[PDB]
Write a protein that binds this ligand. Structure first.
Ligand SMILES: *[C]([O])C1(*)(*)N(*)(*)[C@](*)(*)C(*)(*)C2(*)(*)(*)=C(*)(*)C(*)(*)=C(*)(*)C(*)(*)=C12(*)(*)*
Length: 150
């Protein structure tokens, strides 16, 4: 009973979370996950500011209202060579990664590790935060509030 949460640097408070290294988060689980990080789904405006500070990924993830990929450099295998906040238009499927926004983060790039999940609740799951540099923080708990996600 274990969940890995792979987390990125924050840019103007915005970061990317991948559950178990594969697209596997529903829209409801995404909201609950950000809440566990004392964060919210970013607005489009928040994501555009993050992009302007250096944020890019090669992964679809939820923001408030849409599924997006922030792109700085054009890459053929990431968002079909687009730059800017690329918006997913057509998909059959419902599960992606998520973005989250923490207002208390530094205003620009913060590439320090994440070492807590401050708003997780009591539960039986071993939840491990995995940073890109390999640094890990684990705790026993839960964050999912919708039965359909568990
Ligand atoms: C990157 O960015 C992503 N994917 C792969 C794996 C991992 C880990 C940690 C953090 C992040 C990530």
């Amino acid at each position: 009973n274990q969940i890995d949460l792979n987390v990125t640097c924050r840019y103007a408070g915005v970061f990317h979370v991948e559950k178990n290294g594969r697209y596997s988060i529903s829209r409801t689980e995404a909201a609950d996950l950000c809440q566990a990080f004392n964060s919210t789904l970013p607005t489009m405006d928040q994501m555009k500011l993050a992009l302007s500070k250096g944020f890019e990924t090669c992964r679809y993830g939820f923001i408030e209202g849409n599924v997006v990929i922030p792109r700085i450099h054009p890459n053929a295998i990431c968002a079909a060579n687009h730059t800017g906040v690329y918006i997913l238009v057509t998909s059959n499927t419902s599960h992606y990664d998520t973005y989250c926004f923490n207002a208390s983060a530094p205003p620009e790039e913060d590439c320090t590790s994440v070492t807590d999940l401050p708003n997780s609740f009591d539960g039986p799951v071993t939840i491990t935060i995995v940073n890109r540099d390999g640094t890990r923080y684990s705790k026993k708990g839960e964050y999912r509030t919708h039965q359909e996600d568990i």
